[PDB]
Amino acid sequence: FDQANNLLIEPARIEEEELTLTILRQTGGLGISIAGGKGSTPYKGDDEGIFISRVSEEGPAARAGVRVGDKLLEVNGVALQGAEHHEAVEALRGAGTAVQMRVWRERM
Amino acid sequence: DQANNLLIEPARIEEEELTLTILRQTGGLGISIAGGKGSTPYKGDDEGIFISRVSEEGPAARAGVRVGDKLLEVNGVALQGAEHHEAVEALRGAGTAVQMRVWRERM
């Protein structure tokens, strides 16, 4: 917690966040893993959306700000809402060299 | 309920600790465990043991186990500090009736 005037209060917290990140592809890709999709087992709760499952440390996505557990909302202006897993795979495989993604980030 | 025509947040359960009992079938409990001290956390920086996959129907589902549960105790053996494999061996030798304590959160 936080302390102010001898009172233990709840600290300011970022509950939800929407970030726009730009990953630069390298030899071997973007250095991430995606999980989920419409018709796949949810990665979190009942959410069949696409989430980052692995971020290769000191890799392209690591340097761009990606964090494991982020939900992938758009890639280069193409929204993944309702997309099946493999549709997202080909979207991230064809995003080019610079892959600009808007993600959604939770607290814990 | 409402407060001056303004909706009130409903009652919420933030976290709970359950004691469940799995009856082993076919020699398996019908769950997957992930994590352990010295392994990549399953959630955040918590290095504990977490139920990752509850098999459809099967022992754990009927017992109440759910994905995301953190396993705390198994037949009186505390898992605080257990590595993945020390947790595996504990759950494999837990015998026919495996009584588990878990910690569950809301998402």
């Binding site: 440390e57 | 997957s32 465990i33 992930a34 010295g38 990549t40 990752s52 996959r53 993945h84 494999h85």
Partner: peptide
């Protein structure tokens, strides 16, 4: 970076 998951 040890990701470990087992089926019990």
């Amino acid at each position: 970076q040890r990701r470990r998951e087992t089926q019990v």
